Amino acid sequence: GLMQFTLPVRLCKEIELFHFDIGPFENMWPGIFVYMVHRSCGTSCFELEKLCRFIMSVKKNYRRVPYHNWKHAVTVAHCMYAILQNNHTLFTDLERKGLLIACLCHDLDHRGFSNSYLQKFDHPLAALYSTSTMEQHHFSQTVSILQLEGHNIFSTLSSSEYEQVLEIIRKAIIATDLALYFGNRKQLEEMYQTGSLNLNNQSHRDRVIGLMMTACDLCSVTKLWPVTKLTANDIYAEFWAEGDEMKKLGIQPIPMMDRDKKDEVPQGQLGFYNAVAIPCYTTLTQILPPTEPLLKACRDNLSQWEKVIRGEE
Ligand SMILES: CCOc1cc(F)ccc1-c1nc(CCOc2ccc(C[C@H](OC)C(=O)O)c3ccccc23)c(C)o1
Ligand SMILES: [Mg+2]
Numbered sequence: 252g253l254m255q256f257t258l259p260v261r262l263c264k265e266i267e268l269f270h271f272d273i274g275p276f277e278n279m280w281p282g283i284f285v286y287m288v289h290r291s292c293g294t295s296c297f298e299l300e301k302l303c304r305f306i307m308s309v310k311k312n313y314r315r316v317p318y319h320n321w322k323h324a325v326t327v328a329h330c331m332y333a334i335l336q337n338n339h340t341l342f343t344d345l346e347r348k349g350l351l352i353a354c355l356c357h358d359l360d361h362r363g364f365s366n367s368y369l370q371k372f373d374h375p376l377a378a379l380y381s382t383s384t385m386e387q388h389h390f391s392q393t394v395s396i397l398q399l400e401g402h403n404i405f406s407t408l409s410s411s412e413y414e415q416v417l418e419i420i421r422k423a424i425i426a427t428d429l430a431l432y433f434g435n436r437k438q439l440e441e442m443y444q445t446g447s448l449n450l451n452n453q454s455h456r457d458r459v460i461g462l463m464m465t466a467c468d469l470c471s472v473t474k475l476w477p478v479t480k481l482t483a484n485d486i487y488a489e490f491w492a493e494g495d496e497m498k499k500l501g502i503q504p505i506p507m508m509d510r511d512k513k514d515e516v517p518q519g520q521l522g523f524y525n526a527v528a529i530p531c532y533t534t535l536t537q538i539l540p541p542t543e544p545l546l547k548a549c550r551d552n553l554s555q556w557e558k559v560i561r562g563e564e
């Protein structure tokens with residue numbers, strides 16, 4: 252009850268900022284996540300023993316892939332922590348519990364391949380889940396781990412509160428399917444601009460939590476340039492492996508995934524910032540004004556990618 256997690260001074264200060272990097276020491280990430288749950292949620296939200304056992308089983312079920320790994324999970328959870336802490340009064344007790352857990356769990360047992368590749372390979376998961384293939388698997392793995400003995404971090408909720416939090420976690424994890432993001436943001440755009448966006452409307456909340464999940468999932472584009480630049484190597488390591496596997500199925504991969512077209516990377520990042528990231532953090536800053544540092548950092552990185560293209564690095 253009286254056992255607080257504390258962090259060294261630099262982390263204690265820097266963790267409050269959107270652009271925080273959790274660092275290269277894996278053994279500190281669980282402590283970082285618990286610190287964020289205790290300040291974001293309370294010290295009583297979860298039984299520490301259950302939380303610790305939950306965190307370590309989640310970690311165990313992330314794979315050693317270049318990008319969609321345990322570090323990505325904690326990174327995505329930290330971005331959500333920063334949003335939640337900068338919008339204190341807007342979210343319910345249950346949303347704060349569910350969203351940090353959703354973010355830690357959002358890519359559980361990812362193999363480093365897109366939904367597309369699973370579908371062209373004819374992976375069993377593509378038979379079982381026709382759309383948002385990996386995301387329905389990620390949620391399924393979340394429920395599995397929650398059902399391990401000693402792992403029910405929600406045990407103290409009512410029956411109906413339990414179903415609400417698992418429903419928040421399900422929608423949050425599905426929303427990380429970037430195919431669903433485009434429509435979701437367009438709707439939030441129209442609702443915000445016609446003044447119909449209503450945070451007491453549960454279907455409106457769901458959409459806004461969906462956009463937060465995309466914002467947290469893409470948060471590599473909101474770091475200081477050297478972090479953004481080095482993460483892009485991990486991202487493309489996975490994409491190029493997938494392109495290789497496409498070529499093995501006798502399919503020319505899109506140029507993004509083709510490691511023979513590395514030269515096209517800076518222009519592909521431009522396209523991605525213009526088509527995906529900038530619109531994402533724009534609509535998010537409109538709906539949640541305190542998230543503006545994410546938009547500003549994203550624009551700075553867009554400018555760094557233009558500089559790469561102009562041969563200025
Ligand atoms: C894995 C998570 O993805 C990232 C996370 C990051 F922190 C930074 C970059 C990517 C990243 N993802 C991609 C792959 C997805 O790429 C795209 C998806 C959708 C569209 C938009 C498309 O309209 C043009 C649409 O609506 O589908 C893109 C447009 C230009 C370039 C890449 C695009 C790239 C190149 O960089
Ligand atoms: Mg994912």
Ligand SMILES: [Zn+2]
Nearest residue numbers: 357358427468
């Ligand atoms: Zn992710």
